[PDB]
Amino acid sequence: PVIETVQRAAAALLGASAAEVDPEAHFSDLGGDSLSALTYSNFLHEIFQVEVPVSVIVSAANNLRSVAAHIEKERSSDRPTFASVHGAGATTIRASDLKLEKFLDAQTLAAAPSLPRPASEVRTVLLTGSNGWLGRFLALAWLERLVPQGGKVVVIVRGKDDKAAKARLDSVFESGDPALLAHYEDLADKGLEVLAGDFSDADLGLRKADWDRLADEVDLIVHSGALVNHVLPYSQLFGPNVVGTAEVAKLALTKRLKPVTYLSTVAVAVGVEPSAFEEDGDIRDVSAVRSINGYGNSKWAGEVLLREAYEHAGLPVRVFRSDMILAHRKYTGQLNVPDQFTRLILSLLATGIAPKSFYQLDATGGRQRAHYDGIPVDFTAEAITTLGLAGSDGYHSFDVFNPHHDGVGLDEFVDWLVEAGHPISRVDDYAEWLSRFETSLRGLPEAQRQHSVLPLLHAFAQPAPAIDGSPFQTKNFQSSVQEAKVGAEHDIPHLDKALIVKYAEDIKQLGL
């Protein structure tokens, strides 16, 4: 009796009794997370002989009863799947597999070439991933533009129902900053529609009525959503990142053509040297066979399908590859809490110790010039929204990285926290710092320790190479930002002291 096993497995896994784990509970509410969710997925897989993807277990849409329902269904009973596309238990994937024939119904494909062209005036945007870190500012940038022209922004969010989904959205904007909140509520009242859904599912997990309406009403689609996780295998990422990208394309190839903005990552550059990676090349020509880093490959496969859709039907695409997306420069408490950078700043303040340098020292033991490659999200959202609006034709890809040869890297960040009075001690020798720093992290209260850089300490094993600028190419993005005159900078910004200082305050204020 499936539900009873689901429960008992959960109890075992999470250190509860079976009485504490009622069917209406969510895996997350018992202390579940991505790590334990993987363990759970394999355990249930082995017992029932069916796929139980991590994404089923962690959706805010799914209690344990839903996970059990899924097992039942799959046990008896149809969408694209890793085996239907790549071959069952394959160990390589290849670009020649990722063909639209295998993701979409033939009828949709037959009609797409002769579909009406994109609307010349964008009045209603559909956005995925709006409760995500980047997505929330993409939503807010579209709202600031469209609401004053009486336009609309429709958003898809995971949740049990529309009101639940709306509530998940609302609370990402409650971050200790009243100004942000007033701003969001005001714009949201006027121009936001929130629908519960799931892009890994049929018709994006919506009611047929709303899918048929969006297919008619929507002028432009921004696909910011994905399962963003650097440990899961490709096969757990396939559903969200690949089939997800394809269900979005289905909407974009129905009733009339709809430009897609697609968020991606530098991780797609698997076994190619930075210097050899074309920012605006054909992505299918870049390691066209790959072994099974599943994040990178899942995002790549997404790109490839969109490329196939442009080749088939002339769907306008813009791809934006973006990795270290730092804190908002204006709204307080707004920062991506789980990201490596946040964790690091958190960790330096908690321990109060930093190395002379995070980077290779020189010949004589001295600090060298280095650069940290990230962009604040306020600019990133503005840039993406602006260049995405303008992409009504063709296919173009953009590396949203910070390319400046400015000498602004982690050592300047530490100097700046010190200049602003935070008590951080500088330790001359790196390997000493490293073992002291691990000691000091282990001594931390459990709440802090989990937020800190302690899980990812492998990545501070060595001092980083002392490198200015970025080795990947960024001229398409840099030159477009320049031409479009985005921001006060009319260029990619430089990371400044005001921002680093803001991170320490945002961290105090969120109570880490």
What letter does residue 130 receive in the DSSP assignment? T
SS3 readout for 12-70 = HHHCCCCCCCCCCCCCHHHCCCHHHHHHHHHHHHHHHCCCCCHHHHHCCCCCHHHHHHH
| Neighbouring C-beta atoms of residue 146, cutoff 10 Å | 20
Helix axes 410-419, 340-351, angle to 10 degrees: 40
At 366, list the tokens.
């001295």
Residue 498, SS3?
helix
Q: What is the resolution of this structure in A?
A: 2.4
CB 102 within 8 A of CB 84: yes
Q: Return the closest-CA partner of residue 184 out of 233, 228, 144.
A: 144
Produce one character per residue of 306-315: b if its CB has 16 or more CB atoms within 10 Å, e if not: bbbbbebbbb
Residue 423, SS3?
coil
Residues annotated within a binding site: 131-134, 158, 168, 198-199, 224-226, 264, 295, 299, 322
- Bridge-partner residues for 203, per DSSP? none
CA dist 317 and 283 (Å) reads: 13
Give the side-chain half-sphere CA count within 13 A for 491.
7
157: part of which helix (H) or strand (E)?
strand 152-157
CA dist 216 and 254 (Å) reads: 8
| Neighbouring C-beta atoms of residue 14, cutoff 10 Å | 17
Q: Report the greatest alpha carbon distance in the chain.
A: 70
Residue 399, burial from CB neighbour count under 10 angstroms (0-12, 13-18, 19+): buried
Give the side-chain half-sphere CA count within 13 A for 66.
17
CA dist 16 and 35 (Å) reads: 17
Q: CA 256 from chain center: how many Å?
A: 28
Fold of 77-512: Rossmann fold (3.40.50)
At 305, list the tokens.
């399908």
Q: Return the closest-CA partner of residue 338 out of 231, 455, 446, 170.
A: 455
Residue 77, SS3?
coil
CA dist 53 and 70 (Å) reads: 10
Phi, psi of 30 (to 5 degrees): -90, 5
CB 250 within 8 A of CB 80: no
DSSP-derived pairing of the beta strands 256-257 and 253-254: antiparallel
CB 200 within 8 A of CB 247: yes
Q: Return the closest-CA partner of residue 313 out of 244, 256, 245.
A: 256
Considering only CA atoms, give the Rg of the chain. Answer: 23
Residue 462, burial from CB neighbour count under 10 angstroms (0-12, 13-18, 19+): exposed
CB 145 within 8 A of CB 154: no
CA dist 476 and 22 (Å) reads: 53
273 contact partners, CB below 8 Å, separation of at least 6 = none
- Structure-solving method: X-ray
Residue with tokens 């492998």: 458
CA dist 495 and 378 (Å) reads: 12
CA dist 200 and 55 (Å) reads: 9
- Bridge-partner residues for 365, per DSSP? none
Phi, psi of 170 (to 5 degrees): -55, -40
102 contact partners, CB below 8 Å, separation of at least 6 = 80, 84, 85
CA dist 140 and 153 (Å) reads: 9
Say which amino acid occupies 416.
Answer: W
Residues annotated within a binding site for NADP(+): 131-134, 158, 168, 198-199, 224-226, 264, 295, 299, 322
Residue 156, SS3?
strand
Q: Return the closest-CA partner of residue 28 out of 176, 174, 223, 168.
A: 168
At 37, list the tokens.
């969710």
For 253-292, the DSSP string reads EESEE--EEEEE-GGG-TTS-GGG--TTS-GGGSSSEEE-
The boundaries of every CATH 3.40.50.720 domain in the chain are 77-512
For 163-183, the DSSP string reads HHHHHHHHHHT-SS-HHHHHH
What letter does residue 465 receive in the DSSP assignment? P
- Bridge-partner residues for 400, per DSSP? 322
CB 243 within 8 A of CB 440: no
Helix axes 2-14, 34-48, angle to 10 degrees: 140
CB 193 within 8 A of CB 153: yes
354: part of which helix (H) or strand (E)?
strand 353-355
For 191-258, the DSSP string reads HEEEEE--TTSGGGGS-HHHHHHHHHH--EEEE------SSS-HHHHHIIIIIHHHHHHHHHEESEE-
CA dist 288 and 97 (Å) reads: 10
At 492, list the tokens.
């990619």
Q: Return the closest-CA partner of residue 12 out of 25, 22, 3, 21.
A: 21
